[PDB]
Design a protein around this nucleic acid. Structure first.
Ligand SMILES: [Mg+2]
Ligand SMILES: [Zn+2]
Length: 255
RNA sequence: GUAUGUCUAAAGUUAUGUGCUCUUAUUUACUAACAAAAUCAACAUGCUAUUGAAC
């Protein structure tokens, strides 16, 4: 269990990356922390860091302080504070979902405040209106450094990495669109896994490409739109009816 | 007073059907919104004319 050990320091303070982003203009703007005077070159890059849940999970100050929220940088695999962290260093579980069950309507599991509307990009923290449990997984070609790979092989990779990060309802890979969809049991695991897998590679140490994995752009993990598949739509309607019927019990017993 | 407007880099895909070396501006020089109402300082000291072949 993660409860059996103190949390590992993922990255040392001296090993942390610089705050100045890669140059895309002629002058660095000290206010905005971004380059001005021109805009050329891509801003995406592969994360140097990746979470290793069985290795890095452990107790922190947050477990003793009665903390609710998870560590954003633990998910990113780059937390500097390790066991001195105020935030929880483990994959979310039903105990902690239960502890989050009040705040979850307006907050992320990382304690970030949700928005009314999704970004046009469908990236970011997500909407307090929707209660979405599904991640879109794009940029898969860049996440493999453009290595040719069979579709079932890609699906097996996505199955491995995302299943470390929570209980899962469904994974599907679409070959024509070259994108994956991962649905979790709890929205907190979708929130967590999005930040854990954003900008990562799908490559292995076993791959021939592993020694240049940093060169491209990583995984592009976003919120999913509603599934247009009619089978999925009627499944969604069935679970909506079931949720409604389960809620009638509470309203009746309370009044 | 050196106009101004639109475009695009996006994202891969949102699930169904280093050499050499010229140069006394040898520059493709560019802008006109700006101003236009120009005359003091004139001028030398005494005015001119020219040629047809032949019966
Ligand atoms: Mg004008
Ligand atoms: Zn931390």
């Amino acid at each position: 269990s993660w409860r059996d050990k103190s949390a590992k320091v993922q990255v040392k303070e001296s090993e942390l990356p610089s705050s100045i982003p890669a140059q895309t203009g002629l002058t660095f703007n000290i206010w905005y922390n971004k380059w001005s005077q021109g805009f050329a070159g891509n801003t995406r890059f592969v994360s140097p860091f990746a979470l290793q849940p069985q290795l890095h999970s452990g107790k922190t100050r947050g477990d003793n302080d009665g903390q609710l929220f998870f560590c954003l940088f633990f998910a990113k695999g780059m937390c500097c504070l390790g066991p001195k962290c105020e935030y929880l260093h483990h994959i979310p579980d039903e105990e902690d979902i239960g502890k989050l069950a009040l705040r979850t309507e307006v907050l992320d599991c990382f304690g970030r405040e949700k928005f009314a509307d999704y970004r046009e990009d469908m990236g970011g923290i997500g909407s307090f209106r929707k209660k979405n449990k599904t991640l879109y997984v794009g940029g898969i070609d860049g996440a493999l450094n453009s290595k040719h790979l069979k579709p079932a092989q890609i699906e097996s990779r996505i199955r491995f990495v995302f299943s470390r990060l929570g209980d899962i309802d469904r994974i599907r890979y679409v070959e024509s669109k070259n994108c994956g969809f991962v649905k979790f049991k709890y929205q907190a695991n979708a929130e967590f896994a999005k930040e854990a897998m954003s900008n990562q590679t799908l490559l292995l140490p076993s791959d021939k490409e592993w020694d240049d994995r940093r060169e491209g752009t990583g995984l592009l993990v976003k919120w999913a739109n509603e599934d247009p598949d009619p089978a999925a739509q009627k499944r969604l309607q069935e679970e909506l009816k079931l949720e409604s019927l389960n809620m009638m019990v509470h309203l009746i017993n309370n009044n």
